[PDB]
Design a protein around this ligand. Sequence first.
Ligand code: CYC
Ligand code: CYC
Ligand code: CYC
Ligand code: CYC
Ligand code: CYC
Ligand code: CYC
Ligand code: CYC
Ligand code: CYC
Ligand code: CYC
Ligand code: CYC
Lengths: 160, 160, 160, 65, 169, 98, 159, 159, 159, 159, 40
Amino acid sequence: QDAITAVINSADVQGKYLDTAALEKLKAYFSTGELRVRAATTISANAAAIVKEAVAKSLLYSDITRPGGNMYTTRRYAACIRDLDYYLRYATYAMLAGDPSILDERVLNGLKETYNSLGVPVGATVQAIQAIKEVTASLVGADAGKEMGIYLDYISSGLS
Amino acid sequence: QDAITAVINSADVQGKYLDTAALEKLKAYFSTGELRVRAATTISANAAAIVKEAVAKSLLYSDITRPGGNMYTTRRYAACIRDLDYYLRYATYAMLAGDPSILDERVLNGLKETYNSLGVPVGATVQAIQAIKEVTASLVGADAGKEMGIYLDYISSGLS
Amino acid sequence: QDAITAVINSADVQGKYLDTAALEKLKAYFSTGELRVRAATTISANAAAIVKEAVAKSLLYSDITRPGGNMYTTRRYAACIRDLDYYLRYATYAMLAGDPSILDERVLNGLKETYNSLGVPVGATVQAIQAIKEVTASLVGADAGKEMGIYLDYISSGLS
Amino acid sequence: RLFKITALVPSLSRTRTQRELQNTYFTKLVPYENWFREQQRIQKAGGKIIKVELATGKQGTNAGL
Amino acid sequence: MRDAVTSLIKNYDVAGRYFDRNAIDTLKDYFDSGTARVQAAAAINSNAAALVKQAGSKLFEELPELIRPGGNAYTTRRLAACLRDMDYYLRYATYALVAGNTNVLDERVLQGLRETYNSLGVPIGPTVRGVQILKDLVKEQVAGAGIANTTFVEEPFDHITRELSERDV
Amino acid sequence: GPGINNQVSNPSARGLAPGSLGPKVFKLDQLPGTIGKKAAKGASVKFSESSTQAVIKATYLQVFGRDVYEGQRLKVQEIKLENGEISVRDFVRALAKS
Amino acid sequence: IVTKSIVNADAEARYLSPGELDRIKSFVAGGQQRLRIAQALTDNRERLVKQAGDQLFQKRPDVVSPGGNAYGQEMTATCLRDLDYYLRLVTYGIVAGDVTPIEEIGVIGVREMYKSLGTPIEAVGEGVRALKNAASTLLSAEDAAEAGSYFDYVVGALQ
Amino acid sequence: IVTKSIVNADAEARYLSPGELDRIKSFVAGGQQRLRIAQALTDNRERLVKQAGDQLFQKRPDVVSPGGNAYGQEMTATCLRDLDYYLRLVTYGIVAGDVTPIEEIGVIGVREMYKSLGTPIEAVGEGVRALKNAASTLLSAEDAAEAGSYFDYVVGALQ
Amino acid sequence: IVTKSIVNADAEARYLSPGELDRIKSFVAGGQQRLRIAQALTDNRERLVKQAGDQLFQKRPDVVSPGGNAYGQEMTATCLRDLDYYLRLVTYGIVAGDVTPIEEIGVIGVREMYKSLGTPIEAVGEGVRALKNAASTLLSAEDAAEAGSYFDYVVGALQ
Amino acid sequence: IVTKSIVNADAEARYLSPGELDRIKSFVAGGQQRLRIAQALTDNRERLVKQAGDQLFQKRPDVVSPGGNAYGQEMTATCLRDLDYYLRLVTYGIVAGDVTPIEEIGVIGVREMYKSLGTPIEAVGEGVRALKNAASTLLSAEDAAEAGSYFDYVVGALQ
Amino acid sequence: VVDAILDSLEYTETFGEDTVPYERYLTPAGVALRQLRVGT
Ligand SMILES: *[C@H](C)[C@H]1/C(=C/c2[nH]c(/C=C3N=C(/C=C4\NC(=O)C(CC)=C4C)C(C)=C\3CCC(=O)O)c(CCC(=O)O)c2C)NC(=O)[C@@H]1C
Ligand SMILES: *[C@H](C)[C@H]1/C(=C/c2[nH]c(/C=C3N=C(/C=C4\NC(=O)C(CC)=C4C)C(C)=C\3CCC(=O)O)c(CCC(=O)O)c2C)NC(=O)[C@@H]1C
Ligand SMILES: CCC1=C(C)/C(=C/C2=NC(=C\c3[nH]c(/C=C4\NC(=O)[C@H](C)[C@H]4CC)c(C)c3CCC(=O)O)/C(CCC(=O)O)=C2C)NC1=O
Ligand SMILES: CCC1=C(C)/C(=C/C2=NC(=C\c3[nH]c(/C=C4\NC(=O)[C@H](C)[C@H]4CC)c(C)c3CCC(=O)O)/C(CCC(=O)O)=C2C)NC1=O
Ligand SMILES: CCC1=C(C)/C(=C/C2=NC(=C\c3[nH]c(/C=C4\NC(=O)[C@H](C)[C@H]4CC)c(C)c3CCC(=O)O)/C(CCC(=O)O)=C2C)NC1=O
Ligand SMILES: CCC1=C(C)/C(=C/C2=NC(=C\c3[nH]c(/C=C4\NC(=O)[C@H](C)[C@H]4CC)c(C)c3CCC(=O)O)/C(CCC(=O)O)=C2C)NC1=O
Ligand SMILES: CCC1=C(C)/C(=C/C2=NC(=C\c3[nH]c(/C=C4\NC(=O)[C@H](C)[C@H]4CC)c(C)c3CCC(=O)O)/C(CCC(=O)O)=C2C)NC1=O
Ligand SMILES: CCC1=C(C)/C(=C/C2=NC(=C\c3[nH]c(/C=C4\NC(=O)[C@H](C)[C@H]4CC)c(C)c3CCC(=O)O)/C(CCC(=O)O)=C2C)NC1=O
Ligand SMILES: CCC1=C(C)/C(=C/C2=NC(=C\c3[nH]c(/C=C4\NC(=O)[C@H](C)[C@H]4CC)c(C)c3CCC(=O)O)/C(CCC(=O)O)=C2C)NC1=O
Ligand SMILES: CCC1=C(C)/C(=C/C2=NC(=C\c3[nH]c(/C=C4\NC(=O)[C@H](C)[C@H]4CC)c(C)c3CCC(=O)O)/C(CCC(=O)O)=C2C)NC1=O
């Protein structure tokens, strides 16, 4: 769903026409879409650098990459990079849509089930998503970093 | 394959780059691509009415739709409708590509042997394709109509 | 003078207002100013490399740098580099102005007098300006290299 | 009722270190009902169809197939 | 139930870090919005019982079948229940006004709403329709007594809508 | 299988190997009844057929989950697949319509 | 159109490719013309339903005839209500820029609904064609083209 | 982008989407600028290839070392011809908008090929990166973003 | 850029001509983009110095070689500190909009300083070129153009 | 190698065919030579990592160069630790008799790990080749053949 | 249903025309009961 599609749905289930508050919501979305698109472009620029900096901030040189940790095996390191790239990409989609429903529908659906099945540590994942959020808020600026951090904190809060 | 990929493949067999002759072919393709898009919309509007008018003009009230003909049975009549619907759809695709090789590779690969083995008459199909050509030329326009008719006549020549 | 200032002057000496042909000239200048500025930036990047490549193309390993030639003494080699840097810099100014009047006013005024007074060879200077023009037309592209070569050939033609 | 097909389908993905020689070049009997979509799959994969033959059925049978 | 100040505390507690500049920025936003929020809640609290009656009046103006045979607000026994549900939606909207979140509406209103409404045969479309008669009236009342910007009054009714919503897109 | 070729991940790595973490796959190779060109056809051993019967075993093993009882093997489609016309996906289709 | 590019790049593991960002920026630019077209179709709805019923019942009189479905005042009121629904979905598709939120509510299961209601679908297609003609008369040329876009999608969908 | 959109709508049972038709419209609108970029890269073939190859030999002297593959005039001429081939495929990809011409002419089986030729992959990739830097310096700025991003696909796909 | 116009109109006895007021108003409008570009180069400094040292010591290994100046950990730390200084002055020039407060601190006497330090100036120019390449990879197209502006000024100044 | 035959006969519904029992009996016979080879590679590990770092940094000096990844004592210690890891996995594969417990821990996702670490994979392959050469010098002929077996698997895997 | 499962593209492209099908994915609960038991 969108913010546009959410506004249309909320006006639809009442049978209501588009009143002035919904037009205010759509015009606010059409105002913010500029920096939304620019932020999505520069996040699509260097996603690999963001994931590299995030694991170098949070996960590297810990016991997690040591033997016994969950990132010791090299296929598990590759799976870690894959999961962080997923979090960043779906946070980019939720930032450009302006509605976190795609995070609820595609990422946060059965994810705690999987992470408790595999024995994946949840707190280290939350700290890695936090480091992702700090790196991309530094990279994109504060004004779009707020909206990026909202959906990354949404993923972090639903994960916990 | 497109007209663009055909131009690129011709230059690639030569081993050179895209200089001014190929660039002028590409500018020509772009200028006709505008009206090609408009014709694709106006063809996808009433494809069912096109097939209906074509079979009503050509195939109905004849010996093949009578008992003792190829289009007598209800499953055979439905196969006839879906075959003419295909010829219209793939002529639309070959119109938008500007290139008939995708159309040839898609249907003219085996439809000759299939209509041979099933005992389907060829000339009635050629008449039906010509009726589709007249209906689409009357519906769309002059130059996009003859652009459609080039690939429809390519189908009718490939079946014969 | 500019191209803008030349258009304003040509409209002024008649007492004419700005008619549509002058507005066409100014709007063509405002269209071409983009690549004018980009070309001036990348020529200001590596002017020393252009002068080095030009003397390595045309003047080096000749009799001119041998004893008896005009570039034998090291102060004369430094004066040669200075003159070529002057030609490139004033050609950059004439390219960004879009009017060769500054070449006529600041470079080509009393230059043949000086070069025949000092015994400077004129044909070797013309070939050096030609090598400058080839190097910067390769470096900047063909589309701005045409306008760079126009003013460099203006210097070469006025020198001869 | 049964078609005797013979078709080749090349590999436009990455190259495979096992054969698929039965999968590239094949000749198989396909029923009449599945043959349209199975042909359409070969139509999709860009492969040539060499030989189509009705194995069992007779043309123009209105009842009993 | 989480406040607008306690939801930041939960978001910052799950990461284990301290307060930074951005959380202090949103706390300054909430703390200069609070004086206007309390006045808006007092103005809505004052005339609430008549708001419920006019919301019922315009709700029956919209769809006639609500007070007809094949409807749900037929007798007074079935009318008083619809009017106290109007009372409930206004009450928890004022709760969400002073809290500044939508978590009160989530946790106390919307969580079992589909189960009761499908259980009792109660419709959903006229319910959100009535919720918005309520918020048009509440916007008028807030604009009467002072407060110029009324978007924070505007949001909790819409959040109740979007979760009672039978989503078809 | 390997983690890195999750279908949600690499939509360009769907026909890859299952690795050594996944179960072991079955390709029908060495179709029995193609014994050279030169006239012969009087052999006994014919080692290819003993490996083709196991593909027929594994087809029952994955569609039905177990081996089927002795009285309910589909012998017609069995010998039709061994003859060479019906293929493995055709045999799975004709097995799932039993 | 943003959900289209997002699920399009979401099936892949790649980000949104910047050509898709260009199409989103261009749609963001054209959104003001989209909003004006939608408001112009919004405020003039009853004229469009009146002229659509006009042109339809002049074109096909069997719905008027008692064997047809739209016989009597109640059935003809339900008929014009259906045309009102389709005009509303066309305005939704005009704002959204791509035909997903109109196909999701009006197209995706319409054939079996109208088959188990008894009504023919070709008369509904002629009704949306009449709506397209009336809105083409109501709007300017560049507005009628962009409205006849989505009206054309509905007419192709109902057939 | 037309072939990829057609095969993507071919995998589904449906037509081309309004989003995809917007993509084709934007590609047509940018096509003339892409032909201008192809014009510049065609006319700068010589010096771009030579500067990129010499930047490669400045970075990586192992190939022109006598133990390396590109030892000798003929071997280094074939090295520059390989860089010429890749620049030609980059121009094809800039014109088409897809990377399917780059892919099915020069990407899809190049690892096994350069393994059997004895040539290191990473030095090819560094040479195409040098081509990216040179063509980035020649062109206009966001035009160079366009050219260098196709170059970026070739560089990332070779490794 | 305001001091430039002020001393420019101050050498004359005239006031500030209103075309200069137009350029000051336009710079005042673009100041927000300038501040975002400067903050983006600010927070990512150590990446830029790392990649600049990477590309420089790959390009010129004589500073690494013991005859060169930047031999050993202390000298290479002083080298990366010099690159940090030049990145800082580039951010100052990005905010100020004109190259005066960066030339006043980094350009105006640099040749005799680096001559009496023994270091070559061309290696410093290559280091600022590597900084420009890394910041071009870090920023968007319209941001990398406007950063490569002042980086280009420094590269032209050190030569 | 027993898990290989067990899952191999387990995908089928058949038992373990007695040719597989013959290969298990032969591996059981050769296990003593496998254990001696593994202990000989075990006790002499630091020699092998020393000579591997020797031959690698003589072969490829770019990891030593500051643009490369293994620059400085910490990064070169991490490099020799990686070589220690690969020698350990080679001893595991020597004992297990088949390359499954070494590919499961060192091969199956190594390309994307080393890509998102910045290191080149060809230098790691040259390091395992140097380990193979040093272990070939350390062992007898029939032992070096059987060690160069699994070392050869790792070298082919990293490429 | 069977004809539409085998008609699909996600069958023909992954399995192929001559491979016996095999289990490729499991549910998260389905791996919770499998791997995490007393002998992992
Ligand atoms: C007034 C002289 C006459 C009259 C008028 C009247 N009634 C209403 C509104 C309502 N009446 C009901 C009635 C009932 N609910 C019950 O359960 C029963 C028992 C059988 C009855 C009679 C209800 C539910 C309403 C409200 C909804 C509605 O509009 O119908 C009005 C409208 C009041 C208003 O504007 O709010 C009026 C004018 N009824 C009498 O008793 C007199 C004969
Ligand atoms: C009025 C706008 C609509 C309507 C309402 C209606 N509701 C009921 C019955 C109940 N409603 C509730 C609702 C809530 N309980 C809660 O705790 C909360 C959150 C705080 C809500 C919103 C409950 C529990 C009931 C059951 C009665 C009870 O309270 O025990 C009825 C009665 C149904 C009946 O036939 O008895 C009606 C009519 N109906 C409409 O038509 C309007 C759309
Ligand atoms: C998408 C490209 C494509 C095409 C075109 C195609 C055609 C096709 N047409 C078929 C049959 C048929 N085709 C016809 C066609 C006709 N009868 C006539 O008299 C006319 C001349 C003509 C109609 C205009 C009929 C009647 C049958 C069924 C014959 C039977 O009962 O066996 C069949 C056999 C299976 C079936 O559909 O029943 C195929 C595969 N398949 C494809 O993949
Ligand atoms: C802005 C326009 C402009 C020009 C060009 C200019 C030229 C100029 N060139 C000079 C000398 C010179 N010029 C040259 C140049 C050349 N001789 C050659 O053989 C080559 C063909 C050619 C170099 C490409 C040399 C060698 C001298 C040295 C004569 C001497 O000083 O002894 C002198 C004498 C004094 C001095 O250099 O400082 C002047 C004034 N002044 C100007 O204001
Ligand atoms: C294991 C037993 C076995 C073999 C040998 C086998 C071969 C085989 N070679 C093929 C293609 C091919 N084979 C060649 C071979 C050559 N081109 C030449 O000019 C040379 C004469 C010859 C190389 C020495 C080429 C170029 C293609 C691809 C042609 C195309 O683009 O369609 C294909 C089609 C699919 C593909 O691999 O792309 C098969 C199945 N399959 C098997 O199961
Ligand atoms: C789009 C949303 C989405 C997610 C997130 C997702 C995750 C996911 N992560 C997995 C494994 C994994 N996930 C992790 C991740 C981590 N472990 C740690 O120690 C870190 C805290 C964290 C990385 C930041 C690891 C290490 C594995 C490997 C377990 C294994 O395969 O043996 C698996 C098992 C199979 C496979 O990777 O291919 C899934 C399905 N699937 C999804 O569809
Ligand atoms: C927004 C999506 C949407 C659609 C498409 C829709 C269709 C719809 N059309 C209906 C009836 C009807 N629809 C028509 C339709 C027509 N009159 C004709 O002759 C023509 C064929 C056509 C219109 C010009 C008629 C005559 C009825 C009444 C039929 C009956 O009572 O059985 C009904 C049942 C009565 C009702 O509850 O309104 C539905 C649900 N409803 C929806 O919510
Ligand atoms: C259009 C797609 C395409 C490519 C890429 C291609 C490459 C190609 N490179 C070749 C040789 C070669 N290629 C190189 C390449 C290099 N030297 C290095 O070290 C660098 C890493 C690299 C430069 C990029 C060398 C040195 C040879 C000669 C090797 C030999 O002769 O054995 C050959 C064999 C001789 C020939 O026919 O030219 C082919 C076919 N051919 C193609 O059709
Ligand atoms: C902000 C204005 C500013 C500049 C420009 C500046 C330069 C500067 N560079 C210095 C040293 C140095 N500078 C370099 C430079 C380099 N390494 C190389 O190989 C390249 C040629 C180049 C950088 C990539 C080296 C190697 C030293 C140490 C030289 C020595 O110790 O003698 C020193 C003396 C040591 C110190 O006090 O830092 C100064 C003052 N200082 C300033 O405050
Ligand atoms: C047992 C399975 C296994 C593998 C394969 C593995 C690789 C591995 N290599 C790493 C770093 C590294 N790996 C290298 C590698 C090299 N030096 C070079 O120049 C060559 C390219 C190569 C070795 C000769 C370097 C230089 C680093 C440090 C890179 C950095 O700090 O960013 C790291 C991150 C730091 C750490 O936690 O150790 C991991 C996890 N870890 C494992 O547990």
